[PDB]
Amino acid sequence: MSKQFVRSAKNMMKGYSSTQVLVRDATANDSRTPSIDTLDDLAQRSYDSVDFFEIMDMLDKRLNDKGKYWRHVAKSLTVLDYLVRFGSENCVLWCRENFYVIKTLREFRHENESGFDEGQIIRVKAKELVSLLNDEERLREERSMNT
Amino acid sequence: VRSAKNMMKGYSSTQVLVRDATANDSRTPSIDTLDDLAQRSYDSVDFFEIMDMLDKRLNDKGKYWRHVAKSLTVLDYLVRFGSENCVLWCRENFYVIKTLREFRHENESGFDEGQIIRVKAKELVSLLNDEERLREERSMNT
């Protein structure tokens, strides 16, 4: 019967493409960090305009979430930080137009049922990206060494 | 004559059955409904339609707690009496089952209605945690 990759097609029936699958699996729901090859692949695929839209529209709905789904925002800021300084130049221009989205994540606070503020990592992760996008002299170089 | 309750544009027999099994009401899922879901979970295309709906129903919050609760009882029946791939689907999505162990909610009356979602989510994790008894339970299902 079905094995390992057939059960992973549960998202394929849910209307997803290869680019939409791995960017969805990148911002997973466990304490695992996205594999760099997935972040590297997303950077290379961001050059294609068809993939770049599906990538950004996916992270758009992953960043506007709150509640117990704090791993939607924390991991999306991680891949978005990689796309900004490794992928297409439109990844920078896209964050400049949706700038007030990560600007509101500056105050993300979600406490789980144990007195632990899980949103603290989302605070420093969002404040760092804003400080990077507002430094064009720094941001331009960071995209140069990664070539 | 009473096909009128098929006001379901887009969904199929399997998708409507699982939605009617986890609907937001006081009606409890019956065994003849659960055994049909377990029977259809053996079929390939029917299996994904059951998991795709339980996925959208388990990931609910707010006052729609009855969608999450019934999806746990339905999933428990699919782990034991359903297909083997149902257990594989629960292993790859074992975190969605654990995130509901911290679920909390109470209606505007004062009673914590999330108390039942926790216990149902807890015993399901401990069920999959005991892989020895799992094959034992799936063996009796002859």
Curated annotation (Swiss-Prot), chain A:
Phosphorylated by PRK1. Belongs to the epsin family. Present with 1970 molecules/cell in log phase SD medium. It is found in: Cytoplasm; Membrane. Residues 11-143 form the ENTH domain. It comes from the Eukaryota. Binds to membranes enriched in phosphatidylinositol 3,5-bisphosphate (PtdIns(3,5)P2) and phosphatidylinositol 4,5-bisphosphate (PtdIns(4,5)P2). Required for endocytosis and localization of actin. Disulfide bonds: none annotated. This is Epsin-2.
